[PDB]
């Protein structure tokens, strides 16, 4: 897989999601966001349990509220198809 293009594409997709924070240390890339599937916690409006982990072989999104866990490609295919088109093309561009 190609991790840096997943980090670049994931950011834009999760940028729309509110409570968006870039948890980027010296060796990892994570994105904190409110989960778009369930709206995260109904009681707490300030909780961002949706996370993106791009330091692995494949950048994966995981929600700690509704237990959603998916790759960034499936997330883009299911929710942002205009972003999904260029994502797989830039993927083909470098592959």
């Amino acid at each position: 897989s190609i991790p840096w293009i997943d980090n670049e594409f994931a950011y834009r997709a999760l940028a729309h999601l509110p409570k968006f924070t870039q948890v980027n240390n010296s060796s990892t890339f994570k994105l904190r966001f409110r989960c778009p599937v369930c709206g995260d916690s109904k009681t707490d409006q300030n909780k961002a349990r949706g996370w993106y982990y791009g330091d692995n072989n494949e950048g994966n999104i995981h929600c700690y509220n509704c237990n959603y866990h998916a790759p960034i490609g499936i997330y883009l295919k299911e929710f942002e198809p205009d972003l999904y088109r260029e994502y797989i093309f830039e993927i083909r561009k470098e592959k």
Partner: protein, 432 residues
Amino acid sequence: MVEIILSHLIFDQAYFSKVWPYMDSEYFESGPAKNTFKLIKSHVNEYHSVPSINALNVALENSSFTETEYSGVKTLISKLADSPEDHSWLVKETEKYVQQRAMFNATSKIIEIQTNAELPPEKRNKKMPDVGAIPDIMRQALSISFDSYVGHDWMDDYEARWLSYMNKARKVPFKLRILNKITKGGAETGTLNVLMAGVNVGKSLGLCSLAADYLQLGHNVLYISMEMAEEVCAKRIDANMLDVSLDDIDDGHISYAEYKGKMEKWREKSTLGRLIVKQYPTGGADANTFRSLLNELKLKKNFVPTIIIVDYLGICKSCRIRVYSENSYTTVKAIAEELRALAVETETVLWTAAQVGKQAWDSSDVNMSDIAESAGLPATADFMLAVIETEELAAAEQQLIKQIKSRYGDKNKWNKFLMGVQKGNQKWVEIE
């Protein structure tokens, strides 16, 4: 224009009648555009009528998707409203939209297949089609035009039907007179013909004799061997054409001068096609493999066959069922159906061999019930011929061919005749 399509699916009976049969869930936005259409499709499947706004709202309330999806569907439903329109602009625009979405989905799937096949094995996410069926998918993206063919009318369309009887381009004549007589003009294109003999009775000698006879009658023949080398089949064809026994070739009783002279004499004759022999490992070729072979033959070798021959269908792999998943019956029936589909697709006479059961071996008669691997093969085959050899027949250099399934004519007439197989020359000769 998804909102217009949904609105006129709801508030237009004429629009729904034409567009609905073709509308599919993969042609709108994955979100409400898809959720709203899924609601409508479920209502139509449950009640066979177009839902109203109240029905859509009720189905929306009795739905399990999240708050974002619920709000999107509610907004989309609230935005649906009938507008003064004309049937033509809507049908044409819907056709354009459906074609564009089909092309988009097809190219997305093509990219997915390409990026999946370029992965190390055992991690390639199986059940995804291989690159071989990349163009076929695109061919499915172009066959969507809101113009489904209802069918053929007996009385309305009979001039076109009559201009198919003297055409005779469907039938490909044999070279033996008896086979033409029983088939009333030879085999037909887009069919699946089968030879049932047993083990070491014939059944590849007959296929080679047919290939040679078709080759002499200006035909392009594609022999496909799943159990023999390309040089063994070519040696059989050489023995048939050059009238030199296989023993003479093995024992070196034919010189290079005679071989060269016979080959050049055959080449200089105008009435001769091209025969190409291709070998695949047993259980390693299917209909998709044969289509890829056809494409690469057309491109690289400008070779367009009409008499495609497969040595044994039972030795081939199904292109749909996973290996050793279903029993022999289902697998062999599927393989035969796929081969017949290939034959009708490329409009070629397809010839194949089939084994008989152990009980039919060394028997003076072979029935249709003696088919080995599946009872569906006789049902999905246009013509079948049973090759029977006994000790008396072997001593007479003859074999009894019984018409088991004769779809081109009446099998009761000329059911059993004696061919003069010559095993040294791999040739069938008549007795008339």
